């Protein structure tokens, strides 16, 4: 159904604000293998409409907080984008952990887990936080659509359904299984990537001199247009002055997210 | 990159390699691209006094 | 910016230092596009 049949659970998290225990806000899965900082989480607590709430399991009874009281952080704080099912979509920067936490009347609940969240910048200007403006390249980011795309994960009855988790055991009465969809699949799109400053190009006899003044680490990719290409890949952060030889057979280069420019010498 | 004669003159020679760019739909904004400053870069890559 | 909806602009040269002035056709290309312009093209911006 959609969904009105599932139930959350308690499970082992390493850290729970006093050592280890069973946690309502465990993290079974983290995926951070998209481009612009999106991360997907899969926890031991649900997210629904009765508006965007968090129904967690606690000592048999079932509870409910909103999703403005929840707070997850890796090395800087995150900003949740949406929640659906056991899953959660956020905009997190790079770190070596995901912590998640909240607070009912007096107690604070937490769960931290070692996962290598990673910011995977698009393009050839390796940035850390995206730019105010720039050219538009092709990106894949964990989308916001929660429709059924083809991905499924398993679950079972032990009155209500429960995920087929490593942190819960299996029943012996009857293995009544079923599958439910993962939203927020990694889908295509168009993302905004920074444009480096204009390279300065001084001429010389069968030579070019590039003066480069970057704001961030950037790829310079040069080649000759002949039978022997001599491809030079470099990452450049410091202001640099690189001199290249340029024949009649031709020479092209690429500076960050700029297009390729072709220069040709003559006598 | 900025060359002003006195500290209270009226003219400054600015050769910053400023280049404007086309904006993206969604909201009003003036984009540009220019060089990192040279005052900073010299300040951090200067020899001892 | 100097915006005109279903317009066409011309740059007015002031002589500031490193004064770059241009003009962009095709922004902001609808209503719900940012400038509350009616048009799909010939919305014209002047940056300075």
């Amino acid at each position: 159904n959609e969904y009105k049949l599932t139930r959350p659970y308690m499970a082992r998290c390493i850290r729970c604000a006093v050592g280890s225990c069973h946690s309502p806000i465990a993290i079974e899965a983290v995926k951070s293998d998209g481009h612009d900082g999106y991360v997907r989480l899969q926890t031991s607590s649900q997210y629904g409409l009765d508006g965007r709430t968090m129904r967690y399991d606690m000592h048999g009874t079932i509870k409910e907080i909103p999703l403005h009281q929840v707070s997850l952080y890796t090395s800087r704080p995150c900003h949740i984008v949406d929640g659906h099912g056991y899953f959660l979509l956020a905009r997190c920067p790079a770190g070596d952990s995901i912590t998640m936490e909240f607070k009912k009347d007096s107690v604070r609940h937490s769960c931290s887990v070692p996962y290598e969240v990673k910011f995977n910048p698009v393009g050839r200007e390796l940035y850390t936080h995206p730019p105010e403006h720039g050219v538009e390249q092709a990106c894949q980011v964990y989308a916001h659509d929660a429709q059924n795309r083809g991905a499924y994960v398993e679950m079972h009855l032990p009155d209500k359904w429960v995920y087929n988790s490593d942190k819960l055991p299996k029943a012996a009465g009857a293995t009544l299984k079923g599958k439910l969809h993962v939203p927020f699949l990694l889908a295509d799109g168009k993302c905004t990537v920074p444009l480096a400053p204009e390279p300065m190009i001084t001429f010389g006899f069968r030579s070019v001199s590039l003066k480069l003044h970057p704001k961030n680490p950037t790829y310079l990719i040069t080649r000759q247009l002949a039978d022997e290409p001599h491809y030079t890949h470099e990452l450049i952060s410091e202001p640099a002055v690189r001199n290249f030889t340029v024949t009649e057979k031709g020479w092209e280069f690429v500076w960050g997210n700029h297009p390729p420019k072709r220069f040709w010498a003559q006598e | 990159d900025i060359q002003s004669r006195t500290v209270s003159s009226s003219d400054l020679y600015a050769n910053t390699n400023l280049v404007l760019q086309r904006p993206k739909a969604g909201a009003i904004h003036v984009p540009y691209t220019q060089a990192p400053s040279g005052f900073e870069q010299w300040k951090k890559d200067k020899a001892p006094s | 910016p100097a915006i005109k909806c279903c317009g066409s602009q011309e740059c007015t040269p002031t002589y500031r230092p490193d004064e770059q002035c241009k003009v962009f056709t095709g922004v902001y290309p609808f209503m719900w596009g940012g400038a509350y312009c009616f048009c799909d093209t010939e919305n014209t911006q002047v940056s300075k």
Partner: antibody
Amino acid sequence: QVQVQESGPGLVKPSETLSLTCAVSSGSINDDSYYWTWIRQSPGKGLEWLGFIHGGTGKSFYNPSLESRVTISKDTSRNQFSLTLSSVSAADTAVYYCARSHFCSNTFCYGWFDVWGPGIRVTVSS
Amino acid sequence: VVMTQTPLSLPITPGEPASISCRSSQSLLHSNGNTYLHWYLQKPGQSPQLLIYGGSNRASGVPDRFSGSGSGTDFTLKISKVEAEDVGVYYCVQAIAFPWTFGQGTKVEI
């Protein structure tokens, strides 16, 4: 292709905040170039534009006759689309429709909107 | 804005032409050269569909039994040959300025 349905209540008690929804089945809401509208048909008055919203960069455009009391919203998690209206009158009885736009690559998408919801009767009454 | 649709109805003669007129307060022509007019068809028991947008531009999955043209504010739909299935109501429709008001209705039957 992209079926749309509609839902919500009927006899909302007068002088109140009325509300309905609209779900686009097998289709995208975050897409650009499709804006999604709201329409009524009162007895004899004829059809009417109320408002809409863009899919991506969803900022709305209402009718100043009822801008004080109308509200359109959006929920991408369920691909839904909705309408809220304060201070219902008596003659607002109508068969509400919700509609998608044609692929707005031109200035013609203003008004030439496409596939509908089958309608929801709404009789403000007791 | 508001606009007058004329006649209120016109039921006659399957197998013949026909036409309807629409008069608008301010002109529905814009500086960019485009007559912002739409014509909605409504069969009984279904939601509105279209025949002619832009004053003279047919739709995609439309029959060729139609045509339309106009000037500024005096606009004209013209049905080339009435069929049996064409019973319903026709609407003149406006786009160039909010509020996007629609026509009052012209009922067609046999």
